[PDB]
Structures are given as structure tokens and as C-alpha cells.
């Protein structure tokens, strides 16, 4: 059933930054675009092509699709689409870096490895054209990997990702 149910709205308004009025209007758009209520991977990548016309965004969009597809059934339902957008577009910085941690930790083992990291950084370079991804990976691990075990925990990744505020740096 493709109808937005009230029980979906109640969990969404409880967990997300959106109001019911926003959810119901977003839902009419989502339905227009996705008549059976399911956003597919091809459809998702197509959105990334719109945002990034002059690279190949497909690798990165596939990685993001999998994080949006929380129940791993190969589709993004509406509730999934909204939960993800709430965090990324209205979340505080910790909520966003936690979502981003899930993006990198592709096997969900609780760590970002050097390989998982190279893979994201390579996907982003493919999405926008212009020294190597390998050098960026070494640099991130140099600052962020405090116990030198070639992996990043959520705390290391989140705290490393969090810059000192510009004003603090200035002092």
C-alpha cells in the first residue's frame, strides 16, 4: 500500500525534525516520483546525476543509498528517506557525523579501515573531478587514528572530524 499511514507519521514526527505538515507535503512529491512508494537505486543515482552533472556520481550514490536503505531490502521507503534527510539536513554535528560514520563503515563492524576509507574518498573524487586519494587517506589516519591500529572508531572519527571552532583556533 502506497498511502502514507498515520502510524508512520507519528514515528516520524517523534524521531525527526520535521512536522506533520512537512511530512505530508514531502510525501506527495515522493509519490509523484515513486508511484509504488519505493525509491530504487537507479532513481537514487539519478538524483546524484542531477546534482553533479559533470562527474560520475554513481559509486558514491550507491554507497549513500545503502545507508538510506536501513532495512537492507534493496529499496528506500518513505520513512527511510525522511529519517535520513532529517539527520543530514537538520541534525546537530554529532548526529551528522554518526550518520557519516555509518556511511564509511560499510561492513558495520564498528570501525573504519584504511580500505573502507579509501573507497569513500575515491567515490567522492569520481563524483567531482579536481593529490591522490591514497594520500588523503594517510593524512586522515595520521590525524585521526590515535592508537595507531589502522582503524577509526566512532569516537576517533567523530572527534577527529570535529575541528576546533575557528575562534578557538585563533587564540
Which positions touch Ca ion (CB under 5 A)? 69, 71, 73, 75, 105, 107, 109, 111, 116, 145, 147, 149, 151
Tell me, rounded to whole angstroms, the distance of Cα 45 from its chain centroid.
13
Annotated binding-site residue? 105:
yes
Give 113's strand partners. Answer: 151
How many whole angstroms separate alpha carbon 111 and alpha carbon 94?
17
147 touching a copy of itself, by CB under 8 A: no
User: What is the nearest approach in angstroms of a copy of itself to the Cβ of residue 85?
Assistant: 5
CB neighbour list of residue 51: distance below 8 Å, 6 or more residues apart? 57
Annotated binding-site residue? 138:
no
Other Cβ atoms less than 10 A from the Cβ of 4: the count is: 19
26 touching a copy of itself, by CB under 8 A: yes
Residue whose C-alpha cell reads 530504487 in the numeric block: 40
Cell of 125: 573524487
- Residue 109 binding partner per list Ca ion, a copy of itself, none, with a CB distance cut-off of 5 to 8 Å that depends on partner kind: Ca ion
> Distance between terminal CA atoms of the chain?
58
Closest CA to 59 of 122, 139, 16: 122
How many whole angstroms separate alpha carbon 84 and alpha carbon 88?
6
92 touching a copy of itself, by CB under 8 A: yes
- Residue 62 binding partner per list Ca ion, a copy of itself, none, with a CB distance cut-off of 5 to 8 Å that depends on partner kind: none
Cell of 70: 536501513
- Residue 107 binding partner per list Ca ion, a copy of itself, none, with a CB distance cut-off of 5 to 8 Å that depends on partner kind: Ca ion
Annotated binding-site residue? 71:
yes
170 touching a copy of itself, by CB under 8 A: yes
Binding residues (CB under 8 A) for a copy of itself: these are: 17, 19, 22, 26, 29-30, 32-33, 47, 50-51, 81, 85, 88-95, 159, 162, 164-168, 170-171
Annotated binding site for Ca(2+): 69, 71, 73, 75, 80, 105, 107, 109, 111, 116, 145, 147, 149, 151, 156
Amino acid at each position: 500500500n502506497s498511502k502514507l499511514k498515520q502510524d508512520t507519521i507519528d514515528r516520524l514526527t517523534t524521531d525527526t525534525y520535521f512536522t506533520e505538515k512537512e511530512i505530508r507535503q514531502w510525501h506527495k512529491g515522493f509519490l509523484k516520483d515513486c508511484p509504488n512508494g519505493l525509491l530504487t537505486e537507479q532513481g537514487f543515482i539519478k538524483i546524484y546525476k542531477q546534482f553533479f552533472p559533470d562527474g560520475d556520481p554513481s559509486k558514491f550514490a550507491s554507497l549513500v543509498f545503502r545507508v538510506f536503505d536501513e532495512n537492507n531490502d534493496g529499496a528506500i521507503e518513505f520513512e527511510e528517506f525522511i529519517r535520513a534527510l532529517s539527520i543530514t539536513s537538520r541534525g546537530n554535528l554529532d548526529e551528522k557525523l554518526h550518520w557519516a560514520f555509518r556511511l564509511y563503515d560499510v561492513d558495520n563492524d564498528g570501525y573504519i579501515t584504511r580500505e573502507e576509507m579509501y573507497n569513500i574518498v575515491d567515490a567522492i573524487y569520481q563524483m567531482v573531478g579536481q593529490n591522490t586519494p591514497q594520500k588523503r587517506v594517510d593524512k586522515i589516519f595520521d590525524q585521526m587514528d590515535k592508537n595507531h591500529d589502522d582503524r577509526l572508531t566512532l569516537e576517533e572519527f567523530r572527534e577527529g572530524s570535529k575541528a576546533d571552532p575557528r575562534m578557538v583556533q585563533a587564540l
